[model samples]
Structures are given as structure tokens and as C-alpha cells.
Target: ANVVQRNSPSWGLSRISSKKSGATDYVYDSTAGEGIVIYGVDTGIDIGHADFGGRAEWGTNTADNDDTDGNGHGTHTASTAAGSKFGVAKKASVVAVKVLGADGSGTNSQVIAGMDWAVKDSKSRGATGKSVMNMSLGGAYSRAMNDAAANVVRSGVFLSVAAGNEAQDASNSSPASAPNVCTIAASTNSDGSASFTNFGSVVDLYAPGKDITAAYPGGGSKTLSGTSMAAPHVAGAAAYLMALEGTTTSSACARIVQDAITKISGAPKGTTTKLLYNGING
Candidate 1:
């Protein structure tokens, strides 16, 4: 069996696999997220990427002229969640639901339309806890967006959303501001809050986001930074748990929050001290 790396060095994976950090390998149930689906709602996905290992499928496109990603954010987020080699849930299925266009931008209507599609698609597939959605994109607060996210959870799809990179209060952002989703902030490899990560009580926890490596559009890999990179770590964990424990959307969110490692440094006072953990203790 292949050892999960620390030299391709998925520091994020290493960070989350334990409470006090220093783990030699990423360890978890060998099921590795079988029978779970992760929806990457972003700039579309490069389904052909090697790291996906034939598991990535196109879900829907609401942003650009094509079903493929011209920008790479969606691919990165998708792979981060379930890419076989570079992801957290190595055996989970990946579905690309493109909401942002090539310029990494999308209107509220476009984004919400994608969210609506994901909810309906997930329902059409089966029950709630079988799927998880990673929305690594966000914007200014919108009541409609927040309500849409709430409905995603209400309808039984688990949601893990980025807490934005504004370095301000996360409550100022939508979806992150949304009540039910797991709004995730960014943490560095050193276990400190990313300097650009948005803070506040709204954020549920921090995940390793800085310089994280994952599959990119071309057949290669890249290291990117942002709360965008952070959210999918939690999304992958949600899928892993859903596969292993059959957790509901609400219960998955609660379990993730409850299982976090509350030891990050420099987190803002109102923000959570809890850092993302892969439901293990060392």
C-alpha cells in the first residue's frame, strides 16, 4: 500500500490526522471514503486529472460557456476533497458543480443556481448524509445566499464553506454567515491562523490552507493558498465520516466541530480556537 506523503508533503493532511501535530503518515480507516460523494461547487473541475483516479465526474455548470474549468480553483478544491493521491477522502467520488466563471467570479444568482442544483441533485441521488458539498468561494453577505446554504443543510446535504480571506469578521460574508454550514477559516502549517484568514464567532474551525498541495487542471499538481483550500479538508473529513459512520448532515457538522483540536495560536478572540482534526487522537 502507498504511504500518504509528507514530502509531496500534504502538511494539511498531516496536521489534521493528529491533535498535537507531528504525524509520520496520514492514518485513517482503510475504507478511505468509499460510497460517499463530494460536490465541489466552484469554477468547474478537470475530471481528467490523474489524482482523481477515474472517480471525478461532471455534475453541472452554471457559470461559464463550457462544462470544463478555464480557471483552476474548482479543480484544486475538488481534488483536495477526494483526489485519490492528493486528497483527504482518497476513495470518495468527486462531482464538479461549476458556479464561478474563468475569471474566478460569479454573480449571486449564478452561485445560488449552482447551490440549488446541488441540493436537488443530491436529493435525486439518495438521502442527505451520502453527499457533502465544498464551497470554496464566497462574497459579500446576501440573505438569499445564506438561506440557500441553510436549505442545503435542511435538505440533508452537508456543507463545508470557506470563511473568506478578508482578515475581518466572517459574519460579513455569506454562506460563511449562514447558520448551518461548517464555515471554515484558514490555518498555517505552524498552527497559527493565516494572516489573511477572516475571523469571528461565525467560523467553526481552522484548517491548514497555506501552501497546500493538490491536483490542478493540467495532469500535474500545484500549491495554492486561501480559505478556499481550507474548507475542503473539512469536506473530505465529512465524507470520510459519512462513509465510515453514516452520519447525518447535522450530526456530521456537530461531530466535526466537536472533534477539532483547540490549540491553534493567534486566533482572534471571537474566533474559534479549534483547528480541524481528522477525527483521530495521537
Candidate 2:
């Protein structure tokens, strides 16, 4: 119960420079997502990362204690969600699920297994609210995968996923079009959307994804861009709201997560009319 607060500036106008985009849109207080658990379902995480301050648990593929990153995707996403410097929800706990392998490829079975594990372990993990999952990976749509994702979200853990960088309709992407998951698209620092982000009805939100700086394994951080970078912002923001909301009595957990975001106008050039933004306090 003894944690000191840090005073620093958050870079970029994505959070709060212009109301047209969404400024002053953040959850700074209300425990800073304390007790909320964010599952970074990706390559892997640097479990001992000092900047993370949050905790991580390994998914089943953790052979040879290799719950660490060979590919830096997981660590970057995790840091953006809860890292001390780069994070949105500073105190949210993280569970790193290494579904992807060295080549940054993973089967849907493995992804589902990890999702299943997070839901099953929710009670023991000590999250303040229903947990949130951040998946920065995507593939072609499958009924089984869609069914699995629907079940996962409807079962009560929130899933935030990337809409992919394909520039095609998001319906073509597997988990992005999956039911009940919050699909993310990339937006640049200025209020326009990124060219790589998928478009259409499948996308539920947009965040500062281009040129985002986040943690790297071993030590330090790196800058990356994609809808992959955008999903975690949604996850961390959801966790912060749920942590502050404190009661699940008034609404469905999924609804609570959905309500945390505010709709904003102006997407990339030719996408949807409006995209979701979650920077402000909920």
C-alpha cells in the first residue's frame, strides 16, 4: 500500500491537446488501474522489467522458462499498457501470454488456449474488475476463432484487438471482426488516421499508434507503428475505468468497458465517420 506518484509530461496530442481529437481525456486518478489485470497476449514479455512495475504470468508454451521475448512485440505492447514511463494505466497488473513464437507467428489454438487460461485464472490473479486482454496480432477470419473470441468476451474478460495494417475492410481479419471484442485502428499524432489501419464497421476505436515509444526487453524502449500499437491503449484505458468504477452491479462488464470510451470525429481520410477515443477519465 505504499507507492509514490511520479510527475511527468505525456507526449503527443493524442490524449489531450485538441478536443477535436480528445484532450484531457484520461484516467489519471482512481487507483491508476490498481488491481486491474491486463493480459498482453502476444510474443512474450520481459517479466523482470523494472519499468513495468506490473506483474506478468506465462502462458502454457513457456518451455525452458522462455516466457521472455526473442521478438520484442509483447514487451512493447505491455509497456504501453502499464510501463511506468510509457503506460496509460500505471498500476495495472500484466499477465504476459506468449502465444506467438520467434518468427512472430502463432496458431489460433495457442491464442485461444492463452485466452482460456486468462479467464480461468481471473479469480486467483486478483484483478479489481473483469480483466482486459490486448492482442496485437491478426489473421484471416475463421468461424471457430470468431466463436472462441465471442465466447471469451461474452464470458466476461474484455478483449481489445488490432484491426490489422492491411488497409482492407476489417471484416477480412479474424479476431478483429470477432464479436464483442473492441477492435482498434491506428491514428497518427495529429487527428488523422494512419494509412495502414484497417477500416469499416469492424473497427471500434482509434489511438495514437504511429511512432509510439515503448519498452524493449533486456533494457530500454523502441518506437513502433501499427494497429498493434493501438490496441494496448484501449486495454489500459479500460482497466483504469473499471478500477475506478468499482462496482459491477449497475452494468454488464463488457458494457462498462465499452462505456469508458468517447466517440470522436475525423478518422484517417476515407474510413468511418467517427472513431473511439479513451484518453479521458471515465
Candidate 3:
């Protein structure tokens, strides 16, 4: 995907189609996620990527400004969350929360540290309508992680996390199963649930994640899979909806869960469901 000023890229599937998602008049037409801020807590970011850049820097294993995105996961996740080209909130500031190292693994304490920084920094920066936290990472359950997720949102930051790729009960996952945070499962452009996505009542929603194309590190693009990719779609949608609702209150969050966009994950319209709307649920 190219930045807005660089022209929109054509794709067989689009997560933010005005006509397809039933948001042609609302979020599709606005300041385009301006005045908003979204944070991606994952690997580092490629600050020099053509599709990235904003005011933020952090990491548990590198220099604070060493936002290099060595693993590319952070770059992709951050782009989808709020990059100028691939992001949902195209104009929203992208905050870098580098917790994982190049190996795509990090200790729970490190993850918690990243979350802590985002929570506090978001407030200081005036992240609009709930500074969102897009975490495309997961691990075994940890109370400290759960507490961090809860505290961040309770402090007015909207957090979105991956439901895991193990295809098991989401309740067994880490932050995805954490209370109050938005847990996202992976879905395809066809509205079919991603085979690898963890399922169960704990999953709050699903978004396009299969073969999903997005900005990659080093100023390029790549297609990646997993619920990690899926979580950013929800993060983007959250950013757009927050902009539309003008606040990040229960009403906005509620409506976002049920009303805004179209194309819930799950085929046959009955097997299972995770509403994907662009409007606030309430």
C-alpha cells in the first residue's frame, strides 16, 4: 500500500471499503483519522519507512529511538494501525512500543513495560478519543500482562490484541483473553474465519488477516498471516470509529463492537460470528 499522497493501491480485498463495509458516509469521509493517536506494541518500527513516521520511540531491548523493526512484525502492525498508507487511521499518529526483539519474542515483563509506557505516554500526548494500543503479540497467560491491559484501557486507552493462532479457546491465550481488552480473531476477505485463529466465546471480533498485504520494513510491502495481522484491522477500525463518535466512551466502544463496519468473520452466517462494523457498537 502507498501513502495517501502517493495514491491508493488496488487490492482484491480491502478492510476499509466505504461501499462494502457500510461506512461510505461516516468514517470513510472525515478528517481521515486526524487528531487521533494509535500505538503499536510489538517489534520495533522502521522509522525511515516511506509509510511511517511520527512522534514516539520505545523499546525494551534497544535504544529508545532504535525503532528499526528488525523482525518486520512491528513495522507491519504499526502500519496497519495508523500508517499513512496501510493504516486504518491514516492520519493518526503512530506510536512505537518496541517490546519484542528481532526474534519476535520477549519476556512478559518487557511486554508489560511497553504497555506501561504506552499507557502513560498516551495520556501525556493527548491521544484523541482513547489512544489505541495494537498488540499483535501473545504468550502464555500472565496476570501482570492482564493487569497492564486492564489498567491501560481503564486509563482511557483502547487496546486491541490478537486472539492467538493455536485455534484453541481464546480464554487460554494471554492478553487476548484478558478482561476488558478487545480480543480479535483472524478472518479472511471472504468473511470466513481464518483456520489458524483461536476461537471460542472469548474472541470479541474478527478482521481480515489472511494474505493481508501491508507495509513492511525497509520501505516495502509484504503479505503476512496470523491473528497478529488481524488485530491491526480492529485497531484501525477503532481509530476511525473513535474519530466518528468524537469520544472513546462506553457508547463508542459498544457501537464499535456491533454497528460500524460490515462483514463479520464466519461463513454460512451461522456457524460463528464476530461482527465487523465501522460504527461504534453502542
Candidate 4:
């Protein structure tokens, strides 16, 4: 079995800092995400990692074993959104709500249950306190997912989701393509929009997705690339912003983070010029 392994010392602090210094950092500094709760709705989380210790909280779900990484995707996504040091919102607490199974696939009903739990938990926890939901996994467009996401949005909780890994086309993916969802696209290191990212009016923001490095299950690390990785960058940024503004509206935070992005020049003409316009304004 291919267990996860941490990056070598050569990975260096500068490399990690460079990833954090982009528009994501601008939004983090603008929002001040420390002490906020950002939920990762995916496979379970590795709560035993030293970096994540004392910073993570499991969801209300009864599955309590924290050392397992059934599907590494969820662990990777959680780390990107809330892992300490490497994560944009390093101080944010991640609530691991396992919706996806070990195969990285789950039914809409499972996802819906997870969303319900996340929203209800956030409400119970209170808005001014801390809580944002980050969904980094998606499948073919589904009405159930959209409806669940919209409900979560209406609850005044921050919800960030992946725009799907499918390459460029106008078609939208569920949860992400759903109305009011902060559908995040992927961008490259040079700030150019990712070639594989789906683009359309549904895309609300863009974040670093290519070759992202973050925590893996079982006390290791890895570089995985996809819109899954990108979504959490926005999630982390939103948590940071929530901490700064003391607010919990996903739409408002999405607006701020989208506005802060520095668009890459020479992007396809007529492509949405701004991914969340508030990062610059806030």
C-alpha cells in the first residue's frame, strides 16, 4: 500500500511561504481567520498529526477513530484548508465530516446528510463564534447537492466547493454550479487560470490548485493537484476573513476573496475578469 510520506527537508520554508503569500494571504490578513471553525466535508481527518494537534475537531458523526485515512483525498483536502503551517488558515479548526467513502465516492444522500450535519452544527455553535464549511469533492451535477448547498448558504454559514476537475467547457458541476455556491476555479503558480479547470459564469473565484503541497493521512505529506485542492484555499481564506470581520455569511466572504485576486493578464477575452472581487477592496 502506498502510505503517505512527508516532504523532504529540501521542500524548504520559502516554498511553503510562497504558496501562502498570494491573494489567499491578502484575504487571510484581511479576514484574520485565527480561531475560526472551517469544516472539511470529505473522508475523515487524521487528527493525530502534530501540526494539526489541538487545532482540529471531529464532526458530530459517531465515527471516532482519527488515525485512519480510508481515502487520502479527504485528508489532503482537509490539510489544505486547515493544516497548520502549510495551510492558509492554519489556525482555523477543521471539523471532519466524512461524506465520501474510502473509494472517494459517496451517494447524494450521504453528502446531503453531511451538509445537514455541518449546517446544524454551525448553527448550534453560533455565527459570531466560528464555523465555515468546505466541500472539496464533487461528482456529476446533482440537484440534491445544489439544494443542500443553497440551504447551507441561506443558513449564513460559509460554504466553499470545488468547480470540478473537468477541463474547460461551459457545463457546471453540482454543488459548485449550484446557485449561490462559491464555485472556485483553479489557477497556476504564474496566476494563469488552470487549463483543466471548468470555466463559465458559475465560477465565483480562483485559487492555487496546481501541484499543491499539504498534509496526508498517517503523518505524511504529498503534492496533489486538482480543483479539490483549490477549493480549500478559498475555504482557508474565508475562515481568515471570517475571523477578521466577525461575520459568517459565505456570500459576503466569497465576494471579498474573489475581489482580492490579481488576475493574470492575457486571459481569454471575455472570461470573467475577476474571481471574487473583495480581496482587493477589503
In terms of TM-score, the best-performing candidate is 1
Please provide, for model 2 over 43-92, each residue's C-alpha lDDT reduced to its tens digit, 9 standing for 90 to 100.
88887777786466554553224666879999989888888777877888
Each candidate's lDDT (Cα)?
0.87, 0.71, 0.69, 0.67
- The residue pairs that clash in candidate 1, if any, are 6-9
Of candidate 1, the 10-residue stretch with the lowest lDDT total is 1-10
| Candidate 4 colliding pairs, count | 15
TM for candidate 3 is 0.85
- Give the C-alpha lDDT of model 1: 0.87
Residue-wise C-alpha lDDT for candidate 1, range 1-282, written one tens digit per residue: 233455435788878887776564776777788888788999999999888999999988998679898899999888888887678998998889999989999999998999999888888888566789999998999999999999888888899999999999999999899978999999988889999999999888889899999888989888999999999999999998888777877888789888887879989988889988876543
Residues 79-174 of candidate 3: C-alpha lDDT, one tens digit per residue: 776776666677676777788888798888888887887777776787634677888988888887888888878888888889899977877878
Q: How many backbone clashes does every candidate have?
A: 1, 8, 12, 15
Show where candidate 2 strays beyond 4 Å: 1-27, 62-65, 123-129, 247-282
What CA RMSD would you report for each candidate? 1.7, 4.0, 4.4, 6.2
**TM-score per candidate:** 0.96, 0.84, 0.85, 0.82
Q: Write the per-residue lDDT of candidate 4 for residues 2-81, one digit (tens) a residue.
A: 11113322122122223333423322342336778888888877777665867887784423343355778777777777
